[PDB]
Write a protein that binds this ligand. Structure first.
Ligand SMILES: C[C@@H]1SCc2ncnc(N3CCN(C(=O)[C@H](N)Cc4c[nH]c5ccccc45)CC3)c21
Lengths: 318, 10
C-alpha cells in the first residue's frame, strides 16, 4: 500500500476540469504508471462522487487484456489518485486525427479486442460500459486496445435488465438513450458501431454541432456508407447501428456472441484475441519509456505542481 | 478529424 511520495512525476499527459494525468515512475519498482489525480474539492463540488466510486469498483474487479488495469488507488486531504497501467500509444483519437481512416483489417483488429473486452464486462462482471468513444480507447506499448475511463459504467446489469440514466457523450448516444426509454446492454454495441464507423469511414455516422439537430439525425436518419466500404464491413455497421435495440446485432440474449459470429470477423479466433496472439497492425514507435509522442504537446511540454472517502484505498493483489 | 467530445451525466 502506497502514498504520493512512492512515485516520481515525469511528464504531464492531460489536464481537464476534474484533474490531471501524470506519467509516473514508481520508486520501489521502476515501473512506469499513469496517475489520474483528481481534486477532491472538484469531484464533490461538480457532483462527480458517485461516478468516481463506480470507477474504483469497476477497475478493482476487472482483469482483462484490453481494459486498463489499476495497480493502486489512494487519497490525501485534497486528492484522489488512481495509479494505472500506462497506455504508451495514446488515444485512438490521436491516430485517426492524423491518418483519416484505418484499413478494414486494422479496424477489424481493434474491434475484435473491444468485442472481447465488452463481452467480459457484460457476461462475467454484469457491467455495461456506456461511454464507448475514440477518446476512451488507447493503445499500449504493443498496440493492443485499452479501454479507459469507467465512471459512467452501470453495475449489476444481468441479461435484459434496463437502466434510465441519461449519460455518455452526445455524438455517441444510442437512439434508445435519446428516446429517454429504459435501455439495456445493447447500447454498448451501438457505440462499437460508432467507433468502428469512425475507424473505417473517417467521420462520425451522425453529426451536427447543435445537440438537438444531432439527436434528430441519430433518431431519424438511416446510415449511409462511403461507396468503397466492403459489404461485410457494411453489414456489420448496419447491424450495430440499428436504431431499434431489439434488432441490433448484439441485441439478443446472445449478446457479444452475435457479433463474434458475423462474417466481418470470419478469420478471427476469439481465444487468440484474448491471448494477444494476433499481429497488431501498429506498434507505437517510442524511442524510450518517457517518450510521449502520442500525447498532445499542449500537455507534455509543461512543469508539474474535501471529505474522506470510505474504503477508496486499494492495492492490486499479487 | 472532429473536435474532441465531452462525457456528461444527468
Ligand atoms: C488515465 C488513462 S488510464 C491509462 C492511461 N495511459 C496513458 N494516458 C492516460 N490518459 C488518458 C486521459 N487523458 C486525457 O487527456 C483525456 N483525453 C481526458 C481526460 C479524462 N479524464 C481525465 C482526468 C484528468 C485529466 C484528463 C482527463 C490523459 C492521458 C491513461
Amino acid at each position: 500500500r502506497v502514498t504520493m511520495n512512492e512515485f516520481e512525476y515525469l511528464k504531464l499527459l492531460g489536464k481537464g476540469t476534474f484533474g490531471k494525468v501524470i506519467l509516473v515512475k514508481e520508486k520501489a519498482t521502476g515501473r512506469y504508471y499513469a496517475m489520474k489525480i483528481l481534486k477532491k474539492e472538484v469531484i464533490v463540488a461538480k457532483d462527480e462522487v458517485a461516478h468516481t466510486l463506480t470507477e474504483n469498483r469497476v477497475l478493482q474487479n476487472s482483469r482483462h487484456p484490453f481494459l486498463t488495469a489499476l495497480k493502486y488507488s489512494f487519497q490525501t486531504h485534497d486528492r484522489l489518485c488512481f495509479v494505472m497501467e500506462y497506455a504508451n500509444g495514446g488515444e485512438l483519437f490521436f491516430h485517426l486525427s492524423r491518418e483519416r481512416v484505418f484499413s478494414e483489417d486494422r479496424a477489424r483488429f481493434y474491434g475484435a479486442e473491444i468485442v472481447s473486452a465488452l463481452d467480459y464486462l457484460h457476461s462475467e462482471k454484469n457491467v455495461v460500459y456506456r461511454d464507448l468513444k475514440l477518446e476512451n480507447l488507447m493503445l499500449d506499448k504493443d498496440g493492443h486496445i485499452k479501454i479507459t475511463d469507467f465512471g459512467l459504467c452501470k453495475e449489476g446489469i444481468k441479461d435484459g435488465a434496463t437502466m434510465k440514466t441519461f449519460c455518455g457523450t452526445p455524438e455517441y448516444l444510442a437512439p434508445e438513450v435519446l428516446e429517454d426509454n429504459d435501455y439495456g446492454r445493447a447500447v454498448d454495441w451501438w457505440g462499437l458501431g460508432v467507433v468502428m464507423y469512425e475507424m473505417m469511414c473517417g467521420r462520425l455516422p451522425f453529426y451536427n454541432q447543435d445537440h438537438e439537430k444531432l439527436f434528430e439525425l441519430i433518431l431519424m436518419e438511416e446510415i449511409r456508407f462511403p461507396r468503397t466500404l466492403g459489404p461485410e464491413a457494411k453489414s456489420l455497421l448496419s447491424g450495430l447501428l440499428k436504431k431499434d435495440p431489439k434488432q441490433r446485432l448484439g441485441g439478443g440474449s446472445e449478446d457479444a456472441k452475435e457479433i463474434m459470429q458475423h462474417r466481418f470477423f470470419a478469420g478471427i479466433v476469439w481465444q487468440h484475441v484474448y491471448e494477444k496472439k494476433l499481429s497488431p497492425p501498429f506498434k507505437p514507435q517510442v524511442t524510450s519509456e518517457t517518450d510521449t509522442r502520442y500525447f498532445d504537446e499542449e500537455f507534455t511540454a509543461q512543469m508539474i505542481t474535501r471529505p474522506h472517502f470510505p474504503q477508496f484505498d486499494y492495492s492490486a493483489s499479487s | 478529424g472532429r473536435p474532441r467530445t465531452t462525457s456528461f451525466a444527468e
